[PDB]
């Protein structure tokens, strides 16, 4: 019951794209939440963080608008966060989940010490900045859990990382800067140039050129 | 940068990579030493002995041509002055400052510069004390500075 309105959206509906991983590869902007809903809708969970009733003071007075943070994650390998400020509590919450899903970014995972077993920690200790908040994720041995504030603890489990230690410098009481700074760090893990990424990337056909005749047929129909 | 000045100057001697004596130089080491001797008997500091040997005559580097430094050739013979030349002229300049100082006591720009130059001797003379260029009991004073110079 969804109609695509863009190139990537059409490719998702007609099952010409296997998953989101190829999308991350080509750095193509995503502009539909139906892409994420179709792929991992049965394994994605969302949690609202804070709604502070912000307002303003003019010749009329105070009228509160609600702000909504929510991180969306499958608890396995994919998380992202989004914000939404509107006039109503429910409108902010719903839309923020759409944006959080829209801005989902790959979460790269690694091993600590022995490489046996499944990945549970970060590839390396990483930093992210938002305002004055500097969030540093530190690799942890297996079975420790998450050492962070309750909200980033939820964010790291939502991202799927099993064991973490976290150190934060700055005003972490500001939740938005706290989550956004750790997400910048998490987004820096896969962007971090590690030795196992030194292998030369074999360039693959972009989804546009790999599927061009189908793109033209659908666009002429629409 | 400079010791006592806020000058980030960049100008020194950029000696060439080729240490060899130029072929066109139709000069002998004995003649170079003889021209050094003629300048030495005249009473000239080696700083301008090398300068004269460079502008005229045609020597690029005395050290490159012969193999020993100008002060080393003079010191091996024994006619070199006991007081180092750089140490000497700073005392002369301070002497010049103090002559103007007693002529005009109101110049506080001169007083500051004199204090600056005095310590320029003091740090230099301490190093020369350690390297045995001058006796350890050698001291510099305003009263004996006039006797030191000339």
């Amino acid at each position: 019951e969804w109609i695509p309105v863009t190139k990537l959206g059409r490719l998702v509906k007609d099952m010409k794209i296997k998953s989101l991983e190829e999308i991350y590869l080509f750095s193509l902007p995503i502009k539909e939440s139906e892409i994420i809903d179709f792929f991992l809708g049965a394994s994605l969970k969302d949690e609202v963080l804070k709604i502070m009733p912000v307002q303003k003071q003019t010749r009329a007075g105070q009228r509160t608008r609600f702000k909504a943070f929510v991180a969306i994650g499958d608890y396995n390998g994919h998380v992202g966060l989004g914000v939404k400020c509107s006039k109503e509590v429910a409108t902010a919450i719903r839309g923020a989940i759409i944006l959080a899903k829209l801005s989902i970014v790959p979460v790269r995972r690694g091993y600590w010490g022995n490489k046996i077993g499944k990945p549970h920690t970060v590839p390396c200790k990483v930093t992210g900045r938002c305002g004055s908040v500097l969030v540093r994720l530190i690799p942890a041995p297996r079975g420790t859990g998450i050492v962070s504030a309750p909200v980033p603890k939820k964010l790291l489990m939502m991202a799927g990382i099993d064991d973490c230690y976290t150190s934060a410098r700055g005003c972490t009481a500001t939740l938005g800067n706290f989550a956004k700074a750790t997400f910048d760090a998490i987004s820096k893990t896969y962007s971090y140039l590690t030795p196992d990424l030194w292998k030369e990337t074999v360039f693959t056909k972009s989804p546009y050129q790999e599927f061009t005749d189908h793109l033209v047929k659908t666009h002429t129909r629409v | 940068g400079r010791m006592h000045a806020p000058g980030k100057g960049l100008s020194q001697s950029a000696l060439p990579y080729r240490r060899s004596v130029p072929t066109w130089l139709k000069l002998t080491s004995d003649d170079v030493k003889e021209q050094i001797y003629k300048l030495a008997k005249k009473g000239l500091t080696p700083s301008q002995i090398g300068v004269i040997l460079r502008d005229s005559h045609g020597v690029a580097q005395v050290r490159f041509v012969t193999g020993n430094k100008i002060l080393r050739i003079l010191k091996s013979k024994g006619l070199a002055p006991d007081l180092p030349e750089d140490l000497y002229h700073l005392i002369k300049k301070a002497v010049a400052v103090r002559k103007h100082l007693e002529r005009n006591r109101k110049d506080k720009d001169a007083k500051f510069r004199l204090i600056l130059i005095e310590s320029r001797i003091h740090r230099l003379a301490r190093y020369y004390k350690t390297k045995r260029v001058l006796p350890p009991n050698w001291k510099y004073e305003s009263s004996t500075a006039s006797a030191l110079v000339a």
């Binding site: - | 960049l10 950029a14 000696l15 060439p16 990579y17 130029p22 066109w24 301008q48 300068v51 004269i52 460079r54 502008d55 005229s56 005559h57 045609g58 690029a60």
Partner: protein, 83 residues
């Protein structure tokens, strides 16, 4: 320009730059042999001269240091030796 040839900078750029900061530091000065009108003797004057160079045979000055290169006289010709 991400990549510029540090190992082999161009001769035009190297001569354009300062005598320092080079691949191998070298003088911008040179040697050159003096012939003055009315005289046969050949003098040797190094570039950037700072002392009076008077010809013994001609009994006349050759170059007066006026800052920078020693501005020589009118009649004397210059021939830069050794490149």
């Amino acid at each position: 320009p991400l990549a510029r040839d540090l190992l082999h900078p161009s001769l035009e750029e190297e001569k354009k730059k300062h005598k320092k900061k080079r691949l191998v530091q070298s003088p911008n000065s040179y040697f050159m042999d003096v012939k003055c009108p009315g005289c046969y003797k050949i003098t040797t004057v190094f570039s950037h001269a700072q002392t009076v160079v008077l010809c013994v045979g001609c009994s006349t000055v050759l170059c007066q240091p006026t800052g920078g290169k020693a501005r020589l006289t009118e009649g004397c010709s210059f021939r830069r030796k050794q490149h």
